[PDB]
Nucleic acid binder design. Structure first.
Lengths: 477, 57
DNA sequence: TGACTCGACATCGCGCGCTAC
DNA sequence: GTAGCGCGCGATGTCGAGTCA
């Protein structure tokens, strides 16, 4: 075995978040520097009138397609002349911005060495001279398109260290293998076909109109050691920041979701906080056209081709992975089959998760603040369990402020719903001490089990302020 | 939930022009600011904006 | 305190992805 | 496209720690 402590697990998740935030901010700032007005004006003169006109074609009403084609020819001519402008293409020192191993990090922490600061001037100078690694090159390419007034995003595949890598060794079996796919690239907006065109002028030297498959998404076990596609962030002229992974992920909901922080709900909410932090403009109609592409993409993925990809899948579950406490919602059935690779003829029943109901016993429901009505049990395990639609909120009874409580003179509060309407919950170890010293008419809160737990008090709201003062003065009792 | 301005500046500068070198700085600063950890979990957007407006310029 | 979970590593047989027509 | 072919990739099981009730 090769396994680390739950503490190291939790550190890896945090440091992953931290490193990701930094990466994505770097994207944000670099995209700023790309917009520099002094540089733009110099790079514009690189683009002949013929090509410029190709980059801004006239609306063609009878066949929009021909305008798209002219843009593609323009984009191809730009890629070519950029090949010529960029005179010196460096190698990444060490690993560049490709994904690193926990061991590699720990050791870079250790050795401090000497690091030449860059800043904004030095970047500009490099791009104008045409000296840099492929990241600089592509980034420059995007600057140039922008100086021609095309809607040109910078795309960045953020490669933070893997927080799903649990191993204590972390050791790999090549430079050529790392550089096979790019970290940075470009998108360009087609107003005629209402789609984003993908452009990689430096590494793959292609232009693709991604529909369901893209040449840029890395393939083969060896190449994915240093490039694990998780967060593809798009930055635009007007300082938008949009997560565009769905364009580039063939299996987004299966393969890729397991490797992103967004797989639990805390993760998603955190991630959205950062994107919004980085998205400094207001919603345009283009944003909507994109969301429509993503929606259709997100609904054409469908069932995966393997059992491992159906573990903890957002939408889907094999009949065999349905929990003892779940049942199939009346009058639903399998939604699909999975031929199991490497077993002859073996087929599995795939159900949609929306057709699966979670059942709980009466006590468990109460513990979610719900009561039952005359319903029927769905299954027994020996204690009857009921579906969510069998159930109903519990509204506990509401002058002086005596609260009708359980037999023990406490209140069972497993959910905000369960505070009476005219009362408030105050959680504090001594809240009972406070309340007892100044009298009143409170009631202890049982919020969970250890086996009860009185974590605080339930008192009428008019009396809350008093307790808060007494608590603040507890040292004086 | 807070940090000096000498560290916030150096960190903006690494993040902006030399992110390859992030690793040891973050190790350091995280070792000098325990509370930063839980901050980052609750309120990332603040730490972001802090890294964005070192441009009081 | 017990069912149920999560990732690594082992084992293993398929048929997948090469040339070389 | 096809046959000849070696082994890479995914299915199955266990092992330890952890999580929920």
């Amino acid at each position: 075995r090769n396994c680390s402590s739950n503490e190291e697990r939790k550190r890896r998740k945090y440091f992953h978040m931290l490193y990701l935030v930094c990466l994505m901010v770097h994207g944000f700032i670099r995209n700023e520097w790309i917009n520099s007005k002094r540089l733009s004006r110099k790079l514009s003169n690189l683009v002949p009138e013929k090509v410029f006109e190709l980059l801004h074609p006239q609306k063609d009403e009878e066949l929009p397609l021909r305008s798209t084609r002219k843009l593609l020819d323009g984009l191809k001519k730009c890629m070519e002349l950029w090949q010529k402008h960029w005179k010196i293409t460096k190698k990444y020192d060490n690993e560049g911005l490709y994904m690193r191993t926990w061991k590699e990090i720990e050791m870079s922490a250790n050795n401090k060495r000497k690091f030449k600061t860059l800043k904004r001037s030095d970047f500009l100078r490099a791009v104008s001279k045409g000296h840099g690694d492929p990241d600089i090159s592509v980034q420059g390419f995007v600057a140039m398109l922008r100086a021609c007034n095309v809607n040109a995003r910078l795309i960045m595949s953020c490669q933070p260290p893997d927080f799903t890598n649990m191993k204590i060794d972390t050791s790999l079996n090549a430079y050529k293998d790392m550089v096979k796919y790019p970290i940075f690239w470009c998108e360009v907006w087609d107003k005629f076909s209402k789609k984003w065109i993908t452009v990689d002028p430096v590494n793959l030297k292609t232009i693709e109109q991604v529909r369901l498959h893209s040449k840029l998404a890395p393939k083969g076990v060896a190449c994915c050691e240093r490039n694990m596609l998780r967060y593809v962030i798009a930055y635009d002229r007007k300082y938008g920041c949009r997560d565009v992974t769905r364009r580039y992920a063939q299996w987004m909901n299966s393969k890729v979701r397991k490797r992103r922080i967004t797989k639990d709900d805390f993760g998603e909410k955190w991630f959205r906080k950062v994107i919004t932090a980085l998205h400094h403009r207001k919603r345009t109609k283009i944003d909507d056209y994109e969301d429509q592409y993503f929606f259709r993409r997100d609904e054409s993925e469908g069932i995966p081709d393997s059992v491992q990809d159906l573990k903890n899948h957002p939408y889907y579950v094999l009949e065999q992975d349905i929990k003892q406490t779940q049942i199939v919602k009346p009058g639903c059935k399998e939604c699909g089959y999975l031929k199991v690779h490497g077993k002859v003829g073996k087929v599995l029943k795939v159900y949609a998760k929306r057709d699966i109901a979670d059942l709980k016993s009466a006590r468990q429901w109460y513990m979610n603040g719900r009561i039952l009505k005359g319903s029927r049990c769905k299954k027994v395990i020996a204690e009857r369990l009921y579906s969510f639609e069998d159930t109903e909120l519990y509204i506990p009874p509401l002058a002086s402020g005596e609260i009708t409580k359980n037999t023990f003179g406490n209140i069972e509060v497993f959910a905000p719903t369960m505070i009476p309407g005219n009362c408030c919950l105050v959680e504090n170890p001594v809240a009972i001490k406070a309340a007892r010293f100044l009298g009143v008419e409170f009631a202890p809160a049982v919020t969970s089990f250890k086996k009860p737990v009185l974590s605080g008090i339930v008192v009428a709201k008019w009396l809350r302020e008093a307790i808060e003062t007494a608590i603040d003065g507890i040292e004086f009792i | 939930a807070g940090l000096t301005v000498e560290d916030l500046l150096s960190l903006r500068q690494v993040v902006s022009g030399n992110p390859e070198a992030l690793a040891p700085l973050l190790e350091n600063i995280s070792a000098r600011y325990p509370q930063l950890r839980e901050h980052i979990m609750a309120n990332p957007e603040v730490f972001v904006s802090m890294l964005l407006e070192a441009v009081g310029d």
